Write an enzyme that holds these catalytic residues in place. Sequence first.
Site, mmCIF file in Angstrom:
data_model
loop_
_atom_site.group_PDB
_atom_site.id
_atom_site.type_symbol
_atom_site.label_atom_id
_atom_site.label_comp_id
_atom_site.label_asym_id
_atom_site.label_seq_id
_atom_site.Cartn_x
_atom_site.Cartn_y
_atom_site.Cartn_z
ATOM 1 C CB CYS B 125 -0.927 0.008 1.206
ATOM 2 S SG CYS B 125 -0.011 0.091 2.718
ATOM 3 C CG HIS B 238 -0.513 5.181 4.189
ATOM 4 N ND1 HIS B 238 0.034 3.968 3.831
ATOM 5 C CD2 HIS B 238 -0.996 5.025 5.443
ATOM 6 C CE1 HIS B 238 -0.108 3.118 4.831
ATOM 7 N NE2 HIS B 238 -0.728 3.736 5.821
#
Lengths: 328, 328
Positions: B125, B238
């Site tokens: 990810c 993120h």
Amino acid sequence: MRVAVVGATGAVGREILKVLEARNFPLSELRLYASPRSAGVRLAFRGEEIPVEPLPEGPLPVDLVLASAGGGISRAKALVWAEGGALVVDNSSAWRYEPWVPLVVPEVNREKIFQHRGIIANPNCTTAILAMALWPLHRAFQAKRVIVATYQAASGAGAKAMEELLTETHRFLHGEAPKAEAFAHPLPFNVIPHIDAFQENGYTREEMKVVWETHKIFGDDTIRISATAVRVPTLRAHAEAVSVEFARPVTPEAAREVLKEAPGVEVVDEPEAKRYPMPLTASGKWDVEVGRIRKSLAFENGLDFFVVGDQLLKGAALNAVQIAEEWL
Amino acid sequence: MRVAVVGATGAVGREILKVLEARNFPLSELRLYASPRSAGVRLAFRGEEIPVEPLPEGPLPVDLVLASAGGGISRAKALVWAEGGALVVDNSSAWRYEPWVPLVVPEVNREKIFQHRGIIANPNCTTAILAMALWPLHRAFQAKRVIVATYQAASGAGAKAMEELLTETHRFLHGEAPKAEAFAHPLPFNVIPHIDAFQENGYTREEMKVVWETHKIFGDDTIRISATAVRVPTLRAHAEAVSVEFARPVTPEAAREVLKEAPGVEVVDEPEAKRYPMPLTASGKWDVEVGRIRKSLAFENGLDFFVVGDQLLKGAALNAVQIAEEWL
């Protein structure tokens, strides 16, 4: 030693009383000064209550002046004071980039304290701690390239902003949309890749300081420094993933022992034991923790470390401490 | 056209079926699978609920398989679920580094799909969202040195790690000590410079993936990469600050024009407008936000930017998009 505390009621000013207390700083007098706003309020020192005088357009009467009250007043009062014969240490950015004022961090150029002619510039937050760790690496390994990513705190935005984060993260948990006011946006559960003022080259005034302050605090305009200042949900501790390219062959084991000797720089480095720097343990201590020392893969002779230092203490600790040295 | 979800109840299993249901996926079978821990539960999908099954020690019966139930389980059945005749697309660190297994990010190596033998790995990810920015810049100027200081959220730690973050802050906000269980240390109002597990080089398993994984998806064994991974008190977005040294003279403006044309990547870079990526203003999108694009002062010809992408979607989304192309 009559000492004044211009700015009293602020985050730094308030911490300035306690470290000043905690280091058993030998005063004679005790003078707290604030701009009109706080013209009639009381703080606490040695358990004893002390008044806060508003600043009088007229220089008097102190041996030492520890300024933590914005650049508005400092740009305006610096000279007026040192002329009255007061030593002036300012935590603002008003005299920092000026050719006649030393920018000092006692771990580095204490030598500059006596090169002053009336004022001494207290370094930025993000710069102080980063130096506390980057000072000894430089001296030993000569750097040439630093790339830092900052994980900055709310206290850097003053006390009102430290409070905002509490109350805001609070309403967040309860559903109501955060009322961003003290930051550029709502900081609860988020990060703002924006700390200060955007300049022409893309960086912010904050980012740009990691450089101009270093280039002077180290007296080496030759170090290539890049930095991304990022604000994050944390009370009072600044984090900054650091990276460097060196002249001499580094060794995470040589930077360690060396780091293991530097003053005011607790080495905190133990992977196996999940042991590294964290605002969790940095906030409060006068030291700066440094960990994750690892042979850098980016550079052909580099290192990747992480650093944490209390943000309100690398305002006030290095302040009340520059004076402790002035004494020397 | 039949599909199954292995880890049908995990945070990632739940985004899968919602971007399955949201991108109007050409499926025809709705088999949701999960480990016995959860052998009695029902999820939603196109209005109707579906029961969730405990992973059968009898691999079959389907064509496509979006596995997301860990590493030990995918290691033990990928080959089997495969021999049955299904195409396994696995979002975990278990097959990604095998020579015959293609690590795919549609936008970079779609063709790699049609060169697989039963299993197609789905990258990290913190790489996927990072690849969406570095790729175009890479095949347009050419990367040589990347340095990224990650600001990863608790979403990637898991579902119980997001839920924990909320109650612990809340608990904290109320004057009581966080009691971590989902993280290495107490995450509320703090940063943790450790993500997965430590390697001997001094780097965590997290960082190194951001490298290894990049080498294989890119086809460039030669690219001095370097990661730093920190968990920040954020929900599911993120952040990363980057600094890539490039060979061809690069341009902040020239690179910026590349990106507005790069797929699945939205540009957000107006300083004067306090316009840059933010977990808040990026958690829930299929595009990754890039901004803060500037001429880096660290290197001669380099670029620095900020990147923000949703973890959970660059889990599910990049997965049901690989399959869309398994159709084309």
